[PDB]
Amino acid sequence: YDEWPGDAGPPPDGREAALFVAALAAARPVLELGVGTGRVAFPLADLGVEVHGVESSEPMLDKLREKAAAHPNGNLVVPVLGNFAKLDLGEQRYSVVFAAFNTLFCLLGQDEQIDCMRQARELLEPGGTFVVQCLNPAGQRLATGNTFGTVELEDTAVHLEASKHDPLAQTLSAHHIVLSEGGGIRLFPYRLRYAYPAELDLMANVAGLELVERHADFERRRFDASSRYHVSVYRAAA
Amino acid sequence: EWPGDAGPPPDGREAALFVAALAAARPVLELGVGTGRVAFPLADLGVEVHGVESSEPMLDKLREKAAAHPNGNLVVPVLGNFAKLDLGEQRYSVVFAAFNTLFCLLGQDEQIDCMRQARELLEPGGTFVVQCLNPAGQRLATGNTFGTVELEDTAVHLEASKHDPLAQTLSAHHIVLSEGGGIRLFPYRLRYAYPAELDLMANVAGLELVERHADFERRRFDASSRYHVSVYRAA
Amino acid sequence: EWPGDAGPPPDGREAALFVAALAAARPVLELGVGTGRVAFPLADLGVEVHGVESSEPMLDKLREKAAAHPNGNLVVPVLGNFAKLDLGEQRYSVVFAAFNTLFCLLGQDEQIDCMRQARELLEPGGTFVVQCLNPAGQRLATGNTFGTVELEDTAVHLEASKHDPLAQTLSAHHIVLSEGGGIRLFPYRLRYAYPAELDLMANVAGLELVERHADFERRRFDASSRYHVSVYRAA
Amino acid sequence: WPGDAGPPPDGREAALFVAALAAARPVLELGVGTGRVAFPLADLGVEVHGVESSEPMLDKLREKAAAHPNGNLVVPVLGNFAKLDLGEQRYSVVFAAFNTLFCLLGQDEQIDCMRQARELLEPGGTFVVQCLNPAGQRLATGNTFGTVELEDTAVHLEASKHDPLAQTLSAHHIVLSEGGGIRLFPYRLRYAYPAELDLMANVAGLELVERHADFERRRFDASSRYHVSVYRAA
Amino acid sequence: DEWPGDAGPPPDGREAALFVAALAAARPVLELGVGTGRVAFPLADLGVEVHGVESSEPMLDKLREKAAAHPNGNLVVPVLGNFAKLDLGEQRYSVVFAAFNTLFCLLGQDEQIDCMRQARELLEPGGTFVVQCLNPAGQRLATGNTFGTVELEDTAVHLEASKHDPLAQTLSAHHIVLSEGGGIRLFPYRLRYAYPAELDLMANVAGLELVERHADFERRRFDASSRYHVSVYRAA
Amino acid sequence: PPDGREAALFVAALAAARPVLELGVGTGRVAFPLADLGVEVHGVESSEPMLDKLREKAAAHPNGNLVVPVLGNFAKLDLGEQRYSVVFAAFNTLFCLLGQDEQIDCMRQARELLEPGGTFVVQCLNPAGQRLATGNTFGTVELEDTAVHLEASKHDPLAQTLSAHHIVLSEGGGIRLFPYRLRYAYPAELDLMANVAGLELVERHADFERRRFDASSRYHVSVYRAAAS
């Protein structure tokens, strides 16, 4: 997993995400929700930024502890355990709290996501920002009901996707499928609950945040109806 | 009005029954009462209806039929805005907006404000009722579209529209083409909301969802429902 | 006399040849003869053609051209119904209905009845020939549609239609918009049938399918064929 | 199987619908399967004779029939309905649920089946079928591939070929399992449009008395994925 | 140039000028299908001499009118002729350009190759040929006939009825304007488009080679989803 | 495609008694029906293994001597002074060359190997009729009792390339992947390419039975001649 080629692997914007976050970090520490294997954390370390990466899954949090011990700048990465819904980190404050590539949408409810957003706000220093990267429903052009599609092709394996979309609950439930020459089959299930921009902004408001800027990606490209994703930056409200 | 699906939904009477069943003997407030498609059927059930409208002229066409209607004394025409809603200490058992009325306010802010005003005009246990297009069931294409609304013997009813899925706005022209060279255009604008969003909006306005149907006959509501009927109570 | 796809299919002559090859130098019957699009090309081949038409006035435009046509005495105009009638002891080698004529009868029953009447007017070995839209090939959307039929320098030919896949009916307006503000509307209705159904209908009427093509030039008929030409015999 | 991968969850509803039409007399189910509808019918005190051509299933019916409280009201019949002789036995209801009628790969075979059903009806008896509604089904021409259902450790997919002329569906229900397991379950259908189906019924000496979208009697329209149709003798 | 939003001409008149100017040297530039000078006049503001070819006289004259009333109007030189039927003598240009589907107004592959060749032969050394063309892939054009909404005004709608032949690669359409009050105006047009790979081969035959391709005159990156493309060609 | 006997008939009816050249002879899909028809076929390849299954079957085939197996590369072929009445490439063979340049070169080489009045024949997928979606797709190709045949592909409408895997899922867990790549061309483009290569289009059909070619045709069969004076 995460060693997959092309579109099967994670978006190749790790470096770009780091630069975007670093530019908002007052040379002070940042908090990544869903740090994963550190696709963004390490590039941030290469820039001299202290990264506290939260991950509810102790399993792969260790692989981070493992890549960090092998990474030239892995000490600037502080592995943290908790829930994006139950973040209790004391009097520690951050200049940036961010959740990349649909992390926020891993919380399977509007309530849970508002709560996560509030928790983020309360962990921000004055002038601090909350940054999220989310799929943009309008640009995704998601069909109603079930679909099946080709994600990526390798010489000896195909990457397919089977998914169920409920446009009411606004949930995506899918399997990433890997068919291998020789009969191998591996299934990687995942669930998302997405939100439309207008909704997401209202959610932020309830959580005491206000939108300050929105882009299509971390390189600050213009965001429009056809953008597959959006990068949103929030500040503490009035 | 116009025939078939060119005219207003034929659920005027069903709407009345649904609202009446929620009327604890006190009066109700219709936002965008129009010509009284629901107001008059409501009078036939012995319910007092205060109907708000900003369209001054169309409000006059209402008074005319009110004097000529057996139960016309039950319809109280009230000019103003779904925003200028300053009706004193008067309180209602039901405040309702039928057939996309709420979505005539071209903004999330304006709609939340309208919802809040509605709440503050409710008596204890009162309910706020809206009928809205359901985006999922509507299957709205991105950008511009053109379609056939209805057919008459001597005219066609067409629609040209622009949909912005970000702003969540519909801007359209109802077009009537008549044999002999007649063309009439009726422009309208909507700003819609998804159920999940609409509910959060209600929350901010101090309302909470109590029930949701596909129509006024209480049919199941699901992803394929073209419309929804939502009932809200005070938080 | 409308250009391109706006007017009737340009296969008038081909239709004649196809029918003639089935005519035992004996007379044929066209249902919905119209202005003789197939009738006159048929006379040029020396085939006696009886033609039925309900429309009294449009049948007159036929008589006019019959007197001015070299072989005009070969076209015999008949007033009556595409349905219930009485043509006496006259029998035909071919009875045919071109370009959706059969589908002008707005019901399965009426169409079976028409088919039966056709059978009973056939001499021994005679054939019943129909040209019908092929639903599979038409790829007809459910509900309402609007599309471009044809373009002229100074006019456009558009179509607004309603499709009910249950009743299997098409109800449309052919629309002509002219530079200068002119609007003309030409309404029509069809009730179509799928091949499998149509064949069962023929069976009930005492007919059996002998051959099916995509057109009058005997091109292979398949799922993508927009139309079909079917030939039936007595059973 | 789970979700949409399994058989429709309306076994209970199908039973009630049939029971309401059964003159407290015995009914005949064509394609009883594992008894998805038969047993619920037994729970309502209705005697169900179940015809089934699949031997792996007819015996499994017997297995559950012995272990079921009301199993004694289910009378299994192994074999092809077209060739089975039921004698002077008559039924109040003959029914075929979930596309059973469309398992006969021809219009002729289906009309014949309908006729056999009519002749086995007592006076005032009814023939009931549940069939996919082509208009609501929105079936694409040619080949298609789609997701049927998702499990934690398996996906349920479908590969199918549709011939809109022959009005046939030929498909494989595919199950991909974590670990490399692949199971294929082929099936074929020959469907009919409502207008056609009704004409077929007429030829078979039946006439339509009512049509619903499902066994709960919801209104049938162009968007209905399925239909439930009830026929009487002429 | 009067119609609003998506109905009017693309609002990139000025950007086009800037892009062409950056490629213009000493000798003038040649616009094929100059129209009302949507790009010509903005080009004069940058001090570039424009020779504008056109065959439509009910519009070439409307150009001269604005040229006399424009501060830098002496920089716009109106010409009557055909993109593939005019010898301009020994005059040479630093840039020859055809904006907004002009090249696709010639209803054939042959006529277009010929136009491209004519353009090449009018280029000074190091001169460039620039075209702006719809990109079929990004355009997502349906087969056969279509009808759609182009734009909305308060008192009128702008509609389009078209016929697309994917074999001949032709578009034949009517821009329709329906006005409150019963007014109907029809504006017919025809295009023959080319795919990028094809267009490049055409340029090769005409003795041109592709030097750069963008999505628009602001040099945005061209990809499969780009509705249009801006292509720059040099002599072989 | 089951039109081999038809591909043979089509080529044969253009060959007369002079020899023909098949590009991408493969396992002899087309060659033998031509041989069974008395036609001499020089077949070209570059992959030596797949050519042996032909040689193997050539010795075991009654008319196996009429099939002459050969080696080289389409764009650059050194076949000496040998000339052919027909040079043909069936089932998207031309589109196996992953570039417009390579394909034009192949077409030129084909022209130069034609005797006077000879013809170049190609069978190609028709983009308009294929209705190919942009980006990635997955579809059902065929069904067996114990296996399904699926397809996963990526389509780049700009490069006009198709990259796919033919997938075979078997009862019991077996999975077999057969990757392939194509670079296709639109008819108008293909014709211009032919012109550059000194060829001109003489006729175009939907298939080898000479059916009508139109926008909806999934494929086309095109015949080219050495361009007019």
Side-chain angles (χ1 to χ4, degrees), chain F residues 32-143:
Chain F
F32 293 117
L34 273 172
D36 288 330
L37 269 39
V39 170
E40 182 177 4
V41 191
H42 297 229
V44 184
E45 270 301 1
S46 35
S47 204
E48 281 202 336
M50 193 183 187
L51 219 196
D52 286 333
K53 190 180 179 181
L54 185 67
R55 276 198 188 94
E56 191 184 29
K57 291 171 62 185
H61 194 272
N63 299 316
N65 59 302
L66 281 172
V67 179
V68 182
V70 180
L71 280 169
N73 273 138
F74 302 159
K76 281 207 166 189
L77 292 161
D78 191 24
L79 288 173
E81 285 87 324
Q82 179 72 64
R83 297 297 130 96
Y84 301 88
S85 54
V86 179
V87 174
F88 75 98
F91 342 108
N92 290 319
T93 289
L94 179 62
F95 289 162
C96 283
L97 304 171
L98 305 177
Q100 193 187 65
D101 285 354
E102 292 87 305
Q103 288 168 359
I104 294 180
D105 285 347
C106 167
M107 278 171 132
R108 206 195 326 269
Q109 187 58 287
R111 181 205 83 200
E112 291 167 354
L113 293 177
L114 291 180
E115 69 184 14
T119 60
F120 178 62
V121 174
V122 302
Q123 182 185 40
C124 295
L125 68 91
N126 178 34
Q130 272 321 292
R131 293 205 84 100
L132 306 154
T134 293
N136 301 357
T137 61
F138 194 89
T140 293
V141 175
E142 186 56 85
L143 305 175

Side-chain angles (χ1 to χ4, degrees), chain A residues 146-148 161-164 173-175 177 179 183-189 191, chain D residues 4 145-155 157 176-182:
Chain A
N146 301 356
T147 61
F148 194 91
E161 186 171 73
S163 83
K164 296 172 60 176
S173 179
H175 275 252
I177 307 171
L179 307 185
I185 300 177
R186 284 163 84 28
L187 305 176
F188 302 92
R191 291 176 175 274
Chain D
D4 305 318
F145 191 95
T147 297
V148 176
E149 185 59 77
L150 305 175
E151 296 189 42
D152 301 357
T153 62
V155 294
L157 315 174
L176 305 184
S177 309
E178 176 69 55
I182 298 179

Side-chain angles (χ1 to χ4, degrees), chain A residues 42-88:
Chain A
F42 291 119
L44 272 171
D46 288 342
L47 277 53
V49 182
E50 179 179 7
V51 194
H52 295 210
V54 187
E55 198 56 291
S56 46
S57 155
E58 268 200 4
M60 59 149 55
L61 217 199
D62 285 334
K63 188 182 180 179
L64 183 65
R65 293 190 168 107
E66 197 191 52
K67 290 184 66 181
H71 195 277
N73 294 313
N75 282 314
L76 280 169
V77 179
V78 184
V80 171
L81 173 72
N83 301 326
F84 321 147
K86 191 162 184 169
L87 294 155
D88 302 45

Side-chain angles (χ1 to χ4, degrees), chain E:
Chain E
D1 55 329
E2 300 294 55
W3 301 334
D6 301 304
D12 63 1
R14 281 150 144 171
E15 285 75 33
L18 287 166
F19 185 98
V20 168
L23 283 165
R27 305 222 75 107
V29 305
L30 182 68
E31 179 173 20
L32 305 182
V34 59
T36 59
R38 181 180 57 92
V39 184
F41 292 119
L43 267 172
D45 289 340
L46 280 53
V48 182
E49 181 182 1
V50 194
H51 287 215
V53 190
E54 199 66 287
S55 61
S56 181
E57 212 64 349
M59 203 193 204
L60 218 202
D61 284 335
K62 190 180 179 181
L63 183 67
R64 281 193 185 91
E65 190 184 29
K66 293 171 62 184
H70 194 272
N72 298 317
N74 57 321
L75 283 173
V76 178
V77 183
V79 179
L80 204 189
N82 282 212
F83 319 146
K85 182 188 159 189
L86 206 57
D87 272 342
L88 303 162
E90 284 86 325
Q91 179 72 64
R92 297 297 131 96
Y93 300 89
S94 50
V95 181
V96 172
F97 75 101
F100 197 55
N101 293 322
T102 292
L103 180 63
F104 290 162
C105 286
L106 305 171
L107 303 180
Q109 193 184 67
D110 287 354
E111 291 86 308
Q112 288 172 356
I113 294 180
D114 287 345
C115 167
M116 278 173 136
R117 205 197 325 270
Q118 274 180 297
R120 183 204 81 205
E121 289 166 356
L122 294 176
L123 292 177
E124 70 180 15
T128 57
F129 179 65
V130 172
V131 300
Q132 184 184 34
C133 301
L134 68 92
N135 177 32
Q139 225 28 240
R140 293 205 86 99
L141 305 151
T143 292
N145 302 358
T146 57
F147 191 96
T149 297
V150 176
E151 190 54 82
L152 304 175
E153 294 188 46
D154 307 358
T155 61
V157 294
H158 293 252
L159 313 173
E160 187 168 70
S162 80
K163 297 172 59 174
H164 173 216
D165 180 354
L167 269 186
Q169 294 177 199
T170 59
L171 285 176
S172 177
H174 275 249
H175 182 97
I176 305 167
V177 190
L178 305 185
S179 314
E180 179 78 57
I184 300 179
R185 292 179 86 18
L186 303 181
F187 301 94
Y189 70 86
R190 292 175 176 275
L191 295 178
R192 190 276 171 176
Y193 62 81
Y195 292 84
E198 168 185 1
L199 188 59
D200 285 346
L201 182 58
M202 290 166 57
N204 290 346
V205 169
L208 296 163
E209 66 178 7
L210 179 68
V211 312
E212 64 184 59
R213 204 199 298 293
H214 317 277
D216 54 32
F217 290 113
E218 302 189 53
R219 291 173 187 93
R220 289 186 175 88
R221 212 195 189 160
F222 172 75
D223 63 30
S225 65
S226 306
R227 286 202 2 122
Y228 283 83
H229 69 74
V230 169
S231 302
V232 184
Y233 298 92
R234 277 186 331 202

